[PDB]
Symmetry: C2
Subunit: 320 residues, 2 copies
């Protein structure tokens, strides 16, 4: 199955991403104020890219293309120096249409030379090929290429792509364990939790669940979940807590979910024993690269839950 | 049930909101750059307040208080001229914690004089009383109260509280029809849709479903749902599409959901035949005040779905009336 093969191509995708970055690094100088536009997974990727832009001392704003089209007055757009359009195919109509409205320099991110790249001042084509309807390793690949480009543009040191790729290899090693979780626990809904850069990862993981498994999935900033959303967590809920650094509040939060009889998978960059039901540790990376190894974990989890439900994640109902 | 009663108090909340505004209008001038901080319902309210700040030509940013505590560098915060903390009780620990780290002027929005109001430079206290763990009419009252303060600060005409309140009187007259939807369709999940100011209303509605009904509910910017999310809508799904203005893309979207066998409830300020299964027309208002009548409606829908499932929305399982943490990690003495 394509989806699984493509998830497992993640380490090679990082290497391709570094190559794509290198090809464009002197052609494209990312400015400080950047607007990011995408749909579906590419919107959650836009959010991630906006976050790292802020983290490096710029101003990053993301919104869905249709909100830019119909409700831009409601959003803190300001005066971006660059607008980034994102589409895996490069043929997403809404992205093309949003960018047509814009006279600002534009950059297109895609897996293909496409309408999108051909409509922009600049293009970052990351040739991670996916035949699945569901975006997997391309999300991660686009993210890494853009990370390097941002770092290069802001005069920061580059990351070591071999090191990042290796982190995703170590994450993919948890495949058999992830299978086991899906076998051990017949969960009926799932809550993904993350803060900062792990929040868009939570949003994307929850989308993988919807698309691949037609499943009840939710995503929240880590501690925000206590404020009413936790009501839907019980003995049939898996809570996937993702954190780069852990502190006493995460211990309490795991225990609060366990008190409602939910089971907790803790995914972290650091060993921490909070009594969680399941644990996956991924290698520590720089602050900005940190989310990268979490992606193939949640992609594998989503894939195996869809297969358990007798579904084909390569071509989901209703989806183009 | 206190929650029904409190939802029905929405008109009276608008008047009280107008009076809280009048009490502070000459003491507080809102600037152009404002950060909004809240949690749960008050976070979704913060998103609404940020949006109207942008609409009125300022810069409004909103994030959950815990994201400000632990991940603020990820957000386009900038250099706000005012930070607004929101908490119905005024005792939500994360609001106090976030505000303590801020040196800029601070405004507290609460239903009570409280830790929050004491910790801020200025306070917008709106005395809507709610006994339910679930926030309802206080959301709408705080919203209207702040909307006045923004227009006043920005030298704009004030809204007419009386007209806004009558708008919600009309919305509430849909109570019977709302039960009928619930009686009619045993839906197993719900998707709320809205664009701009109606998108936070969609998030809030979907939170009311979680809290009151312990139910599978989702919320999206209207046309964003098309990108993969629509996969979970089938014959067991109610799609609640809310829109001020209605156009051709709205028609195609309705039909796309119909083709998946879902049923559609259309809440709008007009009466158009788009193929929907259910229809609710709410009074038209100024563009910023437009979301106000939609709130009672989705609160009623959540309430009636809860009651049909035999649940108690005044005191949902697990939920805490005030969401708290130990505030000071060492008691200094």
């Amino acid at each position: 199955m394509k989806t699984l093969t493509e998830i497992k191509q993640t380490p090679k995708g990082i290497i391709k991403a570094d190559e794509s970055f290198n090809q464009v690094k002197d052609k494209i100088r990312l400015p400080r104020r950047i607007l990011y536009l995408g749909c579906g997974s590419s919107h959650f990727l836009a959010k991630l890219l906006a976050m790292v832009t802020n983290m490096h001392g710029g101003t990053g704003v993301a919104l869905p293309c249709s909100e830019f089209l119909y409700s831009k007055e409601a959003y803190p757009i300001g005066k971006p120096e660059l607008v980034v359009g994102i589409s895996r195919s490069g043929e997403t109509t809404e992205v093309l249409l949003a960018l047509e409205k814009i006279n600002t320099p534009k950059l297109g991110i895609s897996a293909y030379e496409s309408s999108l790249t051909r409509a922009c001042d600049y293009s970052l084509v990351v040739p991670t090929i996916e035949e699945s309807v569901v975006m997997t390793h391309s999300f991660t690949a686009f993210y890494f290429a853009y990370l390097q480009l941002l770092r290069h543009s802001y005069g920061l040191p580059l990351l070591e792509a071999t090191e990042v790729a290796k982190a995703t290899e170590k994450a993919l090693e948890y495949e058999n364990y992830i299978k086991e979780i899906v076998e051990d626990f017949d969960f009926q809904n799932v809550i993904f939790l993350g803060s900062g850069l792990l929040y868009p990862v939570a949003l994307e993981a929850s989308l993988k669940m919807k698309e691949m498994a037609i499943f009840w999935s939710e995503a929240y900033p880590t501690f925000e979940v206590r404020h009413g959303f936790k009501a839907i967590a019980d003995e049939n809920t898996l809570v996937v807590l993702m954190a780069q650094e852990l502190f006493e509040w995460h211990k309490k939060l795991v225990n609060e979910f366990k008190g409602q009889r939910a089971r907790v998978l803790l995914i972290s960059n650091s060993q921490q024993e909070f009594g969680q039901d399941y644990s996956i540790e991924v290698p520590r990376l720089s602050k900005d690269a940190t989310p990268i190894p979490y992606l193939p974990v949640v992609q594998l989890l989503s894939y195996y839950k869809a297969v358990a439900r007798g579904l084909n994640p390569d071509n989901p109902r209703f989806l183009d």
